[PDB]
């Protein structure tokens, strides 16, 4: 299952842009969160994307001219990330695969947490 | 503030061991969580540690024979991670500083989520 040890969620992008994470499907009516994480790197950026406890749906897109792919754990495959909410990269909690899912209807209800949600660009010195 | 873009939380360890994250200070009685993330690497492991939305306290320790330090963002400083819950590395939400805090009284109430909490070892191919 993605997000468990051995199946961590990594992103690789090229050029500047924003990776946006939508955290939804909250238990006990917890409100959804949406936050864009910008990078100014001109080359390759590597990223670690986390879930939050008590949520069951995680959807993300990349907005940037350059490419963006995801990798699970130490797997070798790298596959394209979604670039619009109509075709978001989505994980249902418990799943071992990233799917494409239209989450456009979820976005307006989410609280904005730009620059403070659970997706992180790795630095040049790690 | 730690966990915001630019101030992401990274760990570096040497040798095999377990990095354990205690997520607490939950909003309105959300249960605390504790989970150990093992590594079997004999050399250096690099890690990304995430918060979860709706929690305000994050404490972590390293249990292993080797060293363990944390780095904030692309900062150059690396400082030792706590090695017991009585002297845990702790972040209070909103702080820019990792403090030492005795969280032994919090651990017993936390739900065990070993191998399924918000700390991630980076793979050899990222
Ligand atoms: K921004
Ligand atoms: K950054």
- How many A/B residue pairs have CB atoms within 8 Å? 101
CB A46 within 8 A of CB A90: no
Please give the C-alpha separations between residue B11 and each of A26, A83, B14, B68, B122, in angstroms, as whole numbers: 29, 30, 10, 7, 10
Question: How is the beta sheet containing B55-64 ordered, strand by strand?
Answer: B99-101, B88-92, B55-64, B17-26, B33-39, B111-112
| 3-state SS class at A28 | helix
A68 Cβ neighbours under 8 A, 6+ residues apart: A11, A12, A13, A14, A17, A19, A62, A80, A81, A83
Identify any residues that bridge with A71 across adjacent strands, giving them in sequence order. A10
Residue B101 C-beta-side C-alpha neighbours within 13 Å: 17
Beta strands A88-92 and A55-63, pairing class: antiparallel
Residues of A with CB under 8 A from a CB of B: 3-6, 8, 10, 12, 23, 30, 33, 37-38, 46, 48, 50-55, 71, 73-74, 76, 113, 115-118, 120-126
CB B8 within 8 A of CB B48: yes
CB A17 within 8 A of CB A64: yes
Residue A94 C-beta-side C-alpha neighbours within 13 Å: 3
| 3-state SS class at A25 | strand
Using CA atoms, how far apart are residues B67 and B50, in angstroms rounded to an integer?
A: 21
Cβ atoms within 10 Å of A66's Cβ, excluding its own: 15
Structure tokens at A44: 């390759």
Cβ atoms within 10 Å of A118's Cβ, excluding its own: 24
Q: Name which of B52, B53, B70, B75 to mutate to probe chain A: the one with the most chain A Cβ atoms within 10 A of its Cβ.
A: B53
Residues of B with CB under 8 A from a CB of A: 1, 3-6, 8, 10, 12, 23, 30, 33, 37-38, 46, 48, 50-55, 71, 73-74, 76, 113, 115-118, 120-126
Using CA atoms, how far apart are residues A74 and B42, in angstroms rounded to an integer?
A: 17
Structure tokens at B73: 């963002």
Please give the C-alpha separations between residue B12 and each of A2, A84, B120, in angstroms, as whole numbers: 23, 35, 11
Q: Name which of A7, A23, A53, A122 to mutate to probe chain B: the one with the most chain B Cβ atoms within 10 A of its Cβ.
A: A53
Q: Name which of B48, B93, B125 to mutate to probe chain A: the one with the most chain A Cβ atoms within 10 A of its Cβ.
A: B48
C-alpha of residue A36 to centroid of ligand 1, in Å: 7
* Torsion angle in degrees (nearest 10) through CA of A58, A63, A65, A67: -10
- DSSP sequence for A38-67: EE--SSEEEEEE---TTEEEEEEEEESSS-
Question: How is the beta sheet containing A33-39 ordered, strand by strand?
Answer: A99-101, A88-92, A55-63, A17-26, A33-39, A111-112
Cβ atoms within 10 Å of B125's Cβ, excluding its own: 11
Strand stretches in A1-126, DSSP E: 9-14, 17-26, 33-39, 44-49, 55-63, 68-72, 79-80, 88-92, 99-101, 111-112, 119-121
Q: In terms of C-beta density within 10 A (0-12 exposed, 13-18 middle, 19 or more buried), how is residue A12 classed?
A: middle
Contact A4 B115 (CB under 8 A): yes
Cβ atoms within 10 Å of B58's Cβ, excluding its own: 26
Query: What are the chain A neighbours of B54 within 8 Å (beta carbons)?
Result: 30, 52, 54
Chain CA centroid to CA A97, Å: 13
Cβ atoms within 10 Å of A97's Cβ, excluding its own: 11
Smallest-distance ligand from the CA of A46: 2
């Amino acid at each position: 299952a993605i997000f468990h040890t051995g199946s961590e969620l990594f992103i690789i992008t090229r050029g500047p842009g924003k990776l946006t994470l939508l955290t939804w499907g909250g238990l006990n009516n917890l409100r959804s969160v949406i936050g864009a994480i910008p990078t100014e790197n001109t080359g390759v950026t590597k990223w670690a994307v986390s879930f939050s406890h008590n949520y069951t749906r995680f959807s993300f897109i990349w907005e940037g001219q350059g490419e963006a792919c995801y990798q699970i754990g130490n797997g070798l495959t790298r596959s394209p990330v979604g670039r619009s909410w109509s075709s978001s990269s989505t994980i249902h909690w418990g799943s071992s695969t990233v799917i494409t899912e239209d989450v456009t209807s979820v976005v307006p209800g989410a609280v904005n947490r730009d620059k403070v949600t659970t997706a992180y660009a790795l630095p040049d010195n790690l």
